[PDB]
Amino acid sequence: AVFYKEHKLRNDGLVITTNQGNIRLQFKSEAAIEVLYRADSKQLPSFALAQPESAIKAQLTETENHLQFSGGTLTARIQKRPFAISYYRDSELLLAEESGFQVNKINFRFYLSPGEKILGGGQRILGMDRRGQRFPLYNRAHYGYSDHSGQMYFGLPAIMSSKQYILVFDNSASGAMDIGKTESDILQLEAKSGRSAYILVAGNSYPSLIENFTQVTGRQPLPPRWALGSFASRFGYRSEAETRATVQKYKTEDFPLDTIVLDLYWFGKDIKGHMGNLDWDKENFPTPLDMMADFKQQGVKTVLITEPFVLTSSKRWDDAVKAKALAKDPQGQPKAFELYFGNGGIIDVFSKEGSRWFSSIYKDLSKQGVAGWWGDLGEPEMHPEDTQHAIGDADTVHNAYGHRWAEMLYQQQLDQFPELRPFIMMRAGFVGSQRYGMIPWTGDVSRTWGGLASQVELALQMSLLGFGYIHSDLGGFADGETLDKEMYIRWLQYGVFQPVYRPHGQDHIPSEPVFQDEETKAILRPLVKLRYRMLPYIYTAAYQNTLTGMPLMRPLFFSDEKNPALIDNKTSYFWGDSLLVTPITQAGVESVSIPAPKGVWFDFWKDTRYQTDGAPLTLPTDLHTIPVLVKAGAFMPYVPAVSTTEDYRSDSLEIHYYADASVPLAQGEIFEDDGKDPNSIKRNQFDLLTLQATHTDNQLHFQLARTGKGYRGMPERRATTLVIHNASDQYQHLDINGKTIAIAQADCASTPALACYDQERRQLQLVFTWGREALNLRLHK
Ligand SMILES: OC[C@H]1C[C@@H]2N[C@@H]2[C@@H](O)[C@@H]1O
Ligand SMILES: O=C([O-])C(=O)[O-]
């Protein structure tokens, strides 16, 4: 039995007194509110909020039975007796407390509306709509998963509803979520301990909702462009020779390569007993400074794996103990416990001493030539209950360990290299870990079709709640005795159209594309080159992710917000605005049914035009591609393929525009900068190319422009080939900035024509110079 007693308005926050205690309500933006119960007491700080201290002017009004605390779009309605808070966008009911905060265990209970669909929980393989499911909030490995999981590496204490709110349980501790499983109409959140707070964020659309959420939880800083390149990875290169031979293999096989990744053999010859050395094993890596320098000469970066644990058998045990860097038992000694790798402790990233000790190690190695960082096992993979961290016990801090690990490493990399963008790849974090540049992958996936088939679900679930760069170990990671060639190819094809191109697997079967048979390479080589040719498209989606939270992969359901049933789809997704991709996730599939949104669509590979008023499209399949449709009105930008993003140039642009009269107005954007400067967006050191198409019955008009202050090495003038797909055969006239130019109707591929119509392909090609001044191209019948 809970009831209202008193309220004060302090700072700009609303403090309520019930018979149970104090509740602090602070709007963190016009559409987002932090609700802290037990506000009187001392508890862990927020982990989810980018600006935990902030609060903004809200309106407070009072009636007999209710309080009303309102920002821009979001209103908290506080019923007095019984005490229950509910949330409104306009006068639309988002979410109502049931019992709300219970208190002894932390417990929160809310009503679910009938028909409400609930995405969330981070990594699970349960179906996109998680309503009717119950699962723990306890990051934990799921080695060799395939087609089912209620508990994996990276849970999120958050949901997204079909009513277009996000709800965050801002709690770091061992806990659970029950999404109307136990009780049909109840969402319950629970933890053993930790902060008793939740955050509600509203939006008018899924994009707005995501913009609002990243506003208050954190925006991912634009990664270095090289993170969009080809990674060489396995578990693991055993030697400097083997690592050099793999970089060579990429060069001799003519596959693009930006980064080679070194797994745990860089610090010792065995899987067990060396973890915590954090230093080169010189018997097998005798000249690593030279190695890394030699790779940099070929435009190739080195990334090293690190882990939370220091083994008692490692060379750094005594020193970490001496420095007070490890977590302790309640008795005050270094806590040691038996991992797979052996007996060892865990570095306490929540302490001053642990942070400084660990940071200093990353500094030294980074100075030696390491460009980027991989942090494995941050669940933490093993985390005994009575381990003590500076700010709480293992069970209290568990779900925020990797988060703070990232924060630590990020801050360190920014301080060491303020003119570079950190690369931090990790397996486990918390809500908001994207603000530390976290790039997550979906752990030790099995080498099965089921492993592949689950990757879209996982990617979208993570993407929707802040992690644009979620990806998988391409080809699969765990077990297997012999390569499943077809599955491998399918996985590396999907790879091209997902955030991070990183094949990686246990080294009894080759993970890297350069080690595959002739047929496999002949299929993947042009697709990996394609990934580089598409860097303008991807890098611009990345820019929009830094700007607004918009994920690179978007779910089908974005296409129609009034059709909740689309939420179930996890087999087709949008890569950027323009490409609807359907990965093939079983052997020998001969055709697919694609649930294309109403409109006009083109086969990306074959240029076939399709119109649909709702009905799905059947496309055939081949082994050389996977089905990808382009939306009418798309501008697809390309540059020439390079071996490494270090050699990237946009001097030459090739842009393909998919025309259809069904789209009378279309826009595209290309975001160019130096690909490395972390301040480029803030300081406007960029070149933002825009393209606007206007398509009427008798005319097709393109307006081209550039904004921003540019950057060092930016081309003043780009040679631009614009290819118009599905172009009318009736255009008599082109003018470029008012100057008339004849359109040739033959030999388009075989003269240096400025404008040429290919009648057999229905493509009109325009070649021109795109300088800093605005440009209009007008086609007319
Ligand atoms: O470091 C060895 C191995 C085990 C952990 N699953 C991660 C994986 O990426 C890594 O390759
Ligand atoms: O306008 C068009 O595209 C046509 O008529 O071909």
Coordinates of N, CA and C and ligand atoms in Angstrom, one line a residue, residues 659-661 695-698 726-731 762 781, ligand 2:
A659 N 15.5 5.7 -61.3 CA 14.4 6.6 -61.5 C 13.1 5.8 -61.7
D660 N 12.0 6.4 -61.1 CA 10.7 6.0 -61.4 C 9.7 7.1 -61.2
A661 N 8.8 7.3 -62.1 CA 7.8 8.4 -61.9 C 7.0 8.2 -60.6
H695 N 11.3 14.5 -60.6 CA 10.9 13.6 -61.7 C 9.4 13.9 -62.0
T696 N 9.2 14.6 -63.1 CA 7.8 14.9 -63.6 C 7.6 14.1 -64.9
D697 N 6.5 14.4 -65.6 CA 6.1 13.6 -66.7 C 7.1 13.9 -67.9
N698 N 7.5 15.1 -68.0 CA 8.4 15.5 -69.1 C 9.8 15.9 -68.7
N726 N 16.4 2.8 -65.4 CA 15.0 2.9 -65.8 C 14.7 4.3 -66.4
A727 N 15.7 4.9 -67.1 CA 15.6 6.2 -67.7 C 14.6 6.1 -68.9
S728 N 13.7 7.1 -69.1 CA 12.9 7.2 -70.2 C 13.7 7.2 -71.5
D729 N 13.1 6.7 -72.6 CA 13.7 6.8 -73.9 C 13.2 8.0 -74.7
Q730 N 12.6 8.9 -74.0 CA 12.0 10.1 -74.6 C 12.8 11.4 -74.4
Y731 N 13.9 11.3 -73.7 CA 14.6 12.6 -73.4 C 15.3 13.1 -74.6
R762 N 18.1 0.6 -70.8 CA 17.3 1.6 -70.2 C 18.1 2.5 -69.2
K781 N 11.9 16.1 -72.3 CA 11.4 15.6 -73.5 C 11.1 16.8 -74.4
Ligands
LIG2 O1 8.7 9.1 -67.2 C1 9.2 8.0 -67.5 O2 10.1 7.5 -66.9 C2 8.7 7.4 -68.8 O3 7.7 7.7 -69.3 O4 9.4 6.5 -69.3

